[PDB]
C-alpha cells in the first residue's frame, strides 16, 4: 500500500536540498555581491542529543572573523546557557585554529561547491 | 564457582576513580607537606578527542602561578605546536583572560574534596 514516510524534505542536509551546480552558482553570485564575506553552512550533527536546532543555517561572515568569534555568534543564536558544552567543527570534523581568519580557513577547508561547511555538536566527533 | 577478577587501574577521571574519603585525605597530606602548593588535577575534556592525553594528571602548583603560566606549561607538556588551540576549563566555565593567581582561583573553584579540577579542550567549549 502507501509508504510510511520517515522524515521530511526540509530535514535533508543543504547539499541534498540544492543541486551542486546551483550551490556553485550561489557562491559565485554571493562573492561578486559580497567580496569580503565567506559563505558558511552551519548544521547540527546528525547524532546530537543535547543541543537545540539552528533554524537558519547559511551565514555570510567577514573575511577577518575568527572561529572564536563565530562560535560566540552561534552560541548566541542557539540561546545557550554558558555551561552548555558546544563545539563548532569544520569540513571533516576538523578542529581548526581559533585565531586564523575565516578567509584563510576557507581556502584550506571549503567544499568543491565553494561553501565552507561546519557541524556543531556537544562533543568532538570524531 | 570461579570468578574472573577485573582490575580497574585507571586513575582517570580522578574524581570517579578514588573515594571521596581518600581524596580528602590526600589533599590534607599534600597541604601539610607542601603548604605553598595548590593541588590541581588536569585531565582531557570528555568531549575533546583532538589534543592528546597527559602522562601525568596530578600537579602541585605554586600559589602565585597564574592561568597564562599554567597554559604555557600544559601546552609544552602536550608538545603542542604554537598555532594549535588550547583551553583550560573549570566548573563548566571558560578561564580565558582570568588573571588571578591560582591560590585565589582555588579559593573560589576548589571541589568539595579540596582538589582544584581542570579539563582541557581545543575550543572554548563553554561560554563560561
UniProtKB/Swiss-Prot annotation, chain B:
Keyword Endoplasmic reticulum in record: no
Chief location category: membrane
Lipidation residue positions, type Phosphatidylethanolamine amidated glycine: 127
Effect seen on changing residue 58 to A: Decreases interaction with ATG13 and strongly reduces autophagosome formation
UniProt xrefs under InterPro entries: Atg8-like (IPR004241), Ubiquitin-like_domsf (IPR029071)
One Gene Ontology term of the molecular function aspect: ubiquitin protein ligase binding
The protein, known as: Microtubule-associated protein 1 light chain 3 alpha
